């Protein structure tokens, strides 16, 4: 707890000090250093370094300008290592990768990659950290969704360190499944010699089941490097105060930060804001209802967002680019979870699924058809188990949201009530 | 294109000139000639002729009066042929039949005819042109729904020109199915010698499948004969301008026309208007949402309509009949389609059917149960195919509605969102 | 002109640059530097150093005369710490001039005084001052700039309300320097929009040895200004930390220009984050309202139009769950928390110095009011009473003019939509 916050606090302090340093080298104004487009470029540089470069955006003569500078990968590596007091500090590096992953999960649908892997494009909610490199951190492995892990394994399926790297991924995936039957099936894929089609068939099954019998996937609020550096510069001490990725800390920091974004002509600044907000709290596949309740303003589906990606291609001309303040604050806050929700328990039920007519009145007589009709080796155990599940089943009982003043999480607020961020395109209306 | 509009333009000009002629014979005032009840009677006469007669409604001494005149079927036939410059002009005749069919599809449910044919009364959406005579036009065959065609075939099943007339109907029905499996099944019904129960069983199957794997059925805006004649009389040239049944033309004409209807005491003139509007654009079984969006005012289900049929039986007394203006104009317009929508393609999917919890918050965890659970000879190919379909699947991508000023259909408007016109009676609430 | 806009941007550059220097001297954190409480102390320091009267006096009557102070605040060992810091006045004066390029630039000092005056009008209704002078405590709404000095510069004089001038005059009447009396009368007359009020204001101006009749005039002349309102300038003057922070981040007010009545101050607060210390039983939202109102001279406005511009409700004073911004020496620092001040707005509006078809002929027999623009048609001591009785609380002003989007930099498309100290 205290020990966790200590190290997390150190790596964020590292990223902070690096950014500030990196910002001075480029002779950037404070405002300019707080432009999200600049942060990502600087973030890109240090990851690429471990020549390199990219677009830097300045405010020259009343108009936005785009230079693109280059640095020695040795020069960058030296700046990173030294900002993290001697050490190579891989931890801060993989933290920036996860922030990039989170934003990629919010910005882009990845059906094109799904169809080549033989996977249902509707499995997107299982795809957390798919753009994240194979053999990422321990932190990376935690953040990767069930679908991400299935997709990595099929690519393998399609130099006997291959054997262990295959076994390493099966165990990662097994750790994520919350039922014994799903876990056992992963053993059968892992135990297999010369992996082929049966294994493919099985992994596609397991992916599908993870939509109802959800896996344990970690979520980490990871902010652009400018937010961290800005704080360090303003006099916040991440090592003395400690820090959390899953507590109030990131919400609290975003409440005291001001980030900017370059915005295109037809784009809506409010919509750009939602995208980066979603990315910041790793909520691309979180129910839109709960996101909305937390943020305070409506969190609208991807297809209704009047916005393109955060990054700006070298194609388009800067002469029409303007700068908006990204709204990243929130009405409430909530603890980020590793849980997938209830996948069994079985204990009791408690509820009502039909009515008994009391009054002679013309009307239909409602009943939960799926549930009533439902009740009439390891594969069937799963089928039988996910068939028992209802969309109405409640997870995270007792758990709620908190006021920004309730930093001890003493008094939770349980909310009362579309849901899919990616369920709103030209092919389907979900 | 130009050639199509040329002939369509001619037959509408024919119907026009006939009506004007027919109106003078009966010494009818222009207003009286634009009474929908009078148009249908005149329409009835020329169809019956190919003695005859029916009720004609006049404005005498401040009250509505009902005479019923008679004509020689030779006299009528002469008036029709000569209004269409020499030719027998069957094309204009079958056009009036389709207008009658459209209005019958909007006015009356036909479950009584469905139960005798051994068909599910819920198949009404497949029943376009069921009141239309067997061996109608080529135009008639196009307008007939899948259920209409199945019902005709069972009646056959229940003089070896019978053999071809059976084969002719199987090929009509086959043309309508958009999948190969459905088409193949029709071959098996057609190839059969001595048609009996297996064929019945099969046709009931095919009808059912056509609710999800919809067939290609044509739709034609066909207006009462008074609307056409009124235009010709006012100086519109249908041959010079050409005409379309599926383009902007009928919408444009309705925007420049004023039709009247006799309305009963308790009836709502707004509701009478919707019925004739639906009939005019062949939209009895079109989604109520899209109808509403096009019309501009709400298109209400049949069971919520405070109106009886357009026609007035010789029973009821005229002394309480009054005359209302039928509102048949529209906010937008749309192209009438021959398509049934997507019945396969299969190519990709793109969407989201579940959520991954990000925040520890008490709530249910939504998922598309039908779709997720779904994925666990020619008959089974169809079952397997319609089981893959979801109510959420989007058809007519890119296609939208148009402003009445956008006659070239250059800039479409894609709308964002009950649905069943006949899903609102004392037995069921759909 | 751009020049008018560039000289205003020059002084904000000065204030900004001065505040930055001051913070480095006080070894303050950036966060600590953006605490409204420190900003005030620092602001209070400069004005004290240039308070020649107090300095001339101290040169005669011995304290530590060369120094000046106030409480600075820091966060130490997880808790806020108040400390009385004493600073050498000459060094403050040097840093001011240096941050204003050798110039003593008293317009920069006056700006900060108007900010404090705006803050004072937001916090306290000043009934005791009013009754002592012999005027109605209800005249509350004409008291803008009353907490300012008598000689306060051109900007300061422009900001002062009608009742402020009246109070100054009555103080003098009840009390070589006939020039000060006559000058203040001109400054009073210039505020009056009607010619009838302007005439009576000259009768008082042109008088030797003013007494009863002159005192009685001003009191009625003030009473009239409640209905027949005066031309009182409203300027958006922000805490020095706001300006300091912007300069520090790289905003160039001289180059970019700046106004106190345009969109500028609204834009700045949109890109600012100001903190306040907050007592245990205080609503941070209500403190924020208070400072927001003080920022935009909004104290005596209609609450409705203030709410409409703001976005959230602008609750009246006696229903506001917060006390003053400053913290007294007797207050317990161990209970102090610091919070963000939400000072952003939904729309913006120009800040005024000010205080076709005329009728309708009915066509349809329908129950309704048959409206007519009362002023235009009808405008064709006793005259004052007549004018006051003629006017109605439902008659509209600033016709056509509305509010603008934050995105609408120019005055393109306006949007056409109560007592803060109400009993
Ligand atoms: C004024 C003012 O002056 N010094 C401070 C100040 C500075 C440092 C520590 N504590 C304080 Cl109080 C201050 C202030 O009120 N702050 C600054 C830091 N804030 C913050 C709180 C939590 C998180 N987090 O969890 O990431 C991030 C941030 Cl930046 C809270 C708001
Ligand atoms: C006045 C006025 O005088 N002559 C005309 C006039 C007459 C003939 C042709 N063009 C024109 Cl402009 C006119 C006019 O404005 N009309 C009349 C015909 N209209 C119409 C347009 C389309 C369709 N259609 O597609 O079936 C039907 C109809 Cl009736 C449009 C409105
Ligand atoms: C990113 C980013 O990088 N450089 C700038 C930048 C910096 C300086 C000038 N212009 C710009 Cl655009 C920038 C940005 O978008 N800003 C900073 C300044 N802002 C601002 C706008 C108006 C007023 N005012 O009227 O007082 C005050 C302020 Cl501080 C608007 C938001």
Kind and range of the H or E element at C79?
strand C79-84
**Residue listed under structure tokens 């009658």:** B100
B341 CB neighbour count, 10 Å cutoff: 13
Among the listed residues C260, C231, C263, C232, the one whose alpha carbon sits nearest the alpha carbon of residue C345: C263
Q: Work out the minimum CA distance from A176 to partner chain B, whole angstroms.
A: 13
- Ligand 3 lined by C121 (C-beta under 6 Å): no
Q: Work out the minimum CA distance from A182 to partner chain B, whole angstroms.
A: 16
CA–CA separation, B425 and B303 (whole Å): 6
Interruptions in chain B after residues (C–N over 2.5 Å): 50, 158, 376, 417
What residue of A is the nearest CA neighbor of C284?
A405
Using CB atoms, list chains with 3+ pairs below 8 Å to chain B. A
What residue of A is the nearest CA neighbor of C249?
A30
For ligand 3, atom 7, the nearest C-alpha belongs to C251
- Ligand 3 lined by C268 (C-beta under 6 Å): yes
Q: Are A225 and A232 within 8 A, CB to CB?
A: no
Structure tokens at C160: 């002062």
SS3 content of chain A, % helix, strand, coil (to 5): 45, 10, 45
| Cβ-based neighbours of A227, under 8 Å, separated by 6 or more | A39, A253, A254, A257, A259
Using a CB–CB cut-off of 8 Å, the residues of C that contact A are 29-32, 248-251, 270-271, 273, 340
DSSP bridge partners of C340: C275
Instruction: Report helix, strand or coil for A304.
Output: helix
Q: Work out the minimum CA distance from A235 to partner chain C, whole angstroms.
A: 5
Q: Are C277 and C327 within 8 A, CB to CB?
A: yes
Kind and range of the H or E element at A53?
strand A52-60
CA distances from C98 to B96, B227, C190, C241 (A): 94, 88, 36, 18
Experimental resolution (Å): 3.0
Please give the distance of CA A373 from its chain centroid, rounded to a whole number: 37
| Cβ-based neighbours of C22, under 8 Å, separated by 6 or more | C42, C45, C95
Enumerate residues lining ligand 1, CB below 6 A.
Answer: A 231, 235-236, 249, 252-253, 256; C 29, 31-32, 34-35, 75, 275, 338
Structure tokens at C395: 């008659």
CA distances from B75 to B54, B81, C374 (A): 15, 10, 76
Say which DSSP state A128 is in: T
Asked if C249's CB is within 8 angstroms of A29's CB, the reply is yes
Contact: chain C with chain B (3+ CB pairs below 8 Å): no
Asked if A289's CB is within 8 angstroms of B363's CB, the reply is yes
**Which ligand ends up closest to the CA of A326?**
3
SS3 content of chain B, % helix, strand, coil (to 5): 45, 10, 45
Give the one of A32, A235, A258 whose C-beta lies nearest to C273's C-beta.
Answer: A258
Q: How many CA atoms lie within 13 A of B159 on its CB side?
A: 2
Give the one of B362, B369, B376 whose C-beta lies nearest to A414's C-beta.
Answer: B362
Q: Are C135 and C169 within 8 A, CB to CB?
A: no
Q: Are C71 and C37 within 8 A, CB to CB?
A: yes
Q: Are C133 and C171 within 8 A, CB to CB?
A: yes
Q: Are C141 and C229 within 8 A, CB to CB?
A: no
Asked if A428's CB is within 8 angstroms of B394's CB, the reply is yes
Give the one of A285, A401, A425 whose C-beta lies nearest to B351's C-beta.
Answer: A425
Give the one of C270, C271, C340 whose C-beta lies nearest to A255's C-beta.
Answer: C340
CA–CA separation, A277 and A284 (whole Å): 10
Q: Are B327 and A116 within 8 A, CB to CB?
A: no
**Residue listed under structure tokens 């020499």:** B86
For ligand 1, atom 29, the nearest C-alpha belongs to A253
Asked if A214's CB is within 8 angstroms of B358's CB, the reply is no
What residue of A is the nearest CA neighbor of C268?
A325
CA–CA separation, C63 and A101 (whole Å): 63
Q: How many CA atoms lie within 13 A of A204 on its CB side?
A: 19
Q: Are C276 and C339 within 8 A, CB to CB?
A: yes
CA distances from A379 to A14, A170, C407 (A): 47, 18, 58
Please give the distance of CA C263 from its chain centroid, rounded to a whole number: 17
- Ligand 3 lined by C238 (C-beta under 6 Å): no
* DSSP sequence for A74-108: HHHHHHHHHHTTTS--HHHHHHHHHHHHHHHHHH-
Among the listed residues B47, B99, B33, the one whose alpha carbon sits nearest the alpha carbon of residue B76: B47
DSSP bridge partners of A413: A401
CA–CA separation, C390 and B12 (whole Å): 71
Q: Work out the minimum CA distance from A429 to partner chain B, whole angstroms.
A: 5
- What are the chain C neighbours of A30 within 8 Å (beta carbons)? 248-250
Q: Work out the minimum CA distance from A374 to partner chain B, whole angstroms.
A: 11
A131 CB neighbour count, 10 Å cutoff: 18
Q: Are C204 and C218 within 8 A, CB to CB?
A: yes
Dihedral, CA of residue B14, residue B20, residue B23 and residue B25, to nearest 10: -80
B96 Rama class: left (phi>0) / alpha (psi -120 to 50) / beta: alpha
Instruction: Report helix, strand or coil for B280.
Output: helix
Q: Are B257 and B231 within 8 A, CB to CB?
A: yes
Pocket test for ligand 1, best of A234, A235, A241, A256 (most atoms within 8 A of CB): A256
* DSSP sequence for B288-304: HHHHHHHHSS----GGG
Give the one of C32, C249, C340 whose C-beta lies nearest to A30's C-beta.
Answer: C249
Instruction: Report helix, strand or coil for A257.
Output: coil
Contact: chain A with chain B (3+ CB pairs below 8 Å): yes
CA–CA separation, B1 and A427 (whole Å): 31
| Cβ-based neighbours of A233, under 8 Å, separated by 6 or more | A16, A20, A30, C30
DSSP bridge partners of A66: A57
Q: Work out the minimum CA distance from B375 to partner chain A, whole angstroms.
A: 9
Q: Residue C253 C-alpha to ligand 3 middle, in angstroms?
A: 10
Asked if A234's CB is within 8 angstroms of C29's CB, the reply is yes
DSSP bridge partners of C274: C341
DSSP bridge partners of B66: B57
Asked if C248's CB is within 8 angstroms of A31's CB, the reply is no
Kind and range of the H or E element at B7?
helix B2-25
End-to-end CA distance of chain B: 41
C176 CB neighbour count, 10 Å cutoff: 4
Contacts 24+ apart (CB under 8 A), A74-78: A76/A45, A76/A46, A76/A49, A76/A52, A77/A46, A77/A49, A77/A50
The experimental method is X-ray
Contact: chain A with chain C (3+ CB pairs below 8 Å): yes
Q: Are B367 and A391 within 8 A, CB to CB?
A: yes
| Cβ-based neighbours of C171, under 8 Å, separated by 6 or more | C133
CA–CA separation, B362 and A337 (whole Å): 12
Structure tokens at B290: 């899209």
Query: Of A23, A231, A258, which to mutate for an interface test with C (greatest number of C Cβ within 10 Å)?
Result: A258
Q: Residue C251 C-alpha to ligand 3 middle, in angstroms?
A: 6
Q: How many CA atoms lie within 13 A of B283 on its CB side?
A: 27
Helices first, then strands: H and E counts in chain B = 18, 5
* DSSP sequence for B94-158: HHHHHHHHHHHHHH---HHHHHHTT--GGGGGG-TTSSSPSS--HHHHHH--HHHHHHHHHHHH-
Q: Are B130 and B113 within 8 A, CB to CB?
A: yes
**Residue listed under structure tokens 């009895």:** B284
Asked if C31's CB is within 8 angstroms of A236's CB, the reply is yes
C77 Rama class: left (phi>0) / alpha (psi -120 to 50) / beta: left
């Amino acid at each position: 707890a205290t020990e966790i916050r200590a190290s997390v606090g150190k790596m964020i302090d590292g990223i902070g000090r690096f950014y500030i340093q990196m910002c001075t080298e480029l002779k950037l104004s404070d405002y300019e250093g707080r432009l999200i487009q600049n942060s990502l470029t600087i973030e890109r540089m240090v990851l690429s370094a471990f020549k390199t470069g990219g677009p830097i955006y300045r405010r020259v003569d009343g108009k936005w300008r785009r230079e693109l500078i280059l640095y020695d990968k040795e020069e960058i590596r030296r700046i990173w290592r030294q900002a993290n007091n001697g050490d190579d500090a891989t931890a801060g590096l993989t933290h920036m990768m996860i922030w990039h992953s989170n934003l990629n999960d919010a910005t882009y649908q990845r059906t094109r990659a799904l169809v080549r892997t033989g996977m249902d494009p509707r499995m997107c909610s299982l795809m957390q950290g798919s753009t994240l490199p194979r053999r990422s951190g321990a932190a990376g492995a935690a953040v990767k969704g069930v679908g991400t892990m299935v997709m990595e394994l099929i690519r393998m399926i399609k130099g006997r360190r291959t054997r262990i790297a295959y076994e390493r991924m099966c165990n990662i995936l097994k750790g994520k499944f919350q039922t014994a039957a799903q876990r056992t099936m992963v053993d059968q894929v892992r135990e297999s010699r010369n992996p082929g089609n049966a294994e493919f068939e099985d992994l596609i099954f397991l992916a599908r089941s993870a939509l109802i019998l959800r896996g344990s996937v970690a979520h980490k609020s990871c902010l652009p490097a400018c937010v961290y550096g800005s704080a360090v510069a303003s006099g916040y001490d991440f090592e003395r105060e400690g820090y959390s990725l899953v507590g109030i800390d990131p919400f609290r920091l975003l409440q005291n930060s001001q980030v900017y974004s370059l915005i295109r002509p037809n784009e809506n600044p409010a919509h750009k804001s939602q995208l980066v907000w979603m990315a910041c709290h790793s909520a691309a596949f979180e129910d839109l209802r709960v996101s909305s309740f937390i943020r305070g303003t409506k969190v609208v589906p991807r297809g209704k967002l009047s916005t393109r990606g955060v990054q700006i291609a070298s194609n388009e001309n800067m002469e029409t680019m303007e700068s908006s303040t990204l709204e990243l604050r929130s009405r409430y806050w909530a603890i980020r979870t590793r849980s997938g929700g209830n996948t069994n328990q079985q204990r009791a039920s408690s509820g009502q699924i039909s009515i008994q007519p009391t009054f002679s009145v013309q009307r239909n007589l409602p009943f939960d058809r799926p549930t009533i009709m439902a009740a009439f080796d390891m594969r069937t155990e799963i089928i039988r188990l996910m068939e028992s599940a209802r969309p109405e089943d409640v997870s995270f009982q007792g758990r709620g949201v908190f006021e920004l003043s309730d930093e001890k999480a003493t008094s939770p607020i349980v909310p009362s009530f579309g849901s899919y961020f990616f369920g709103d395109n030209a092919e389907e209306y979900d």
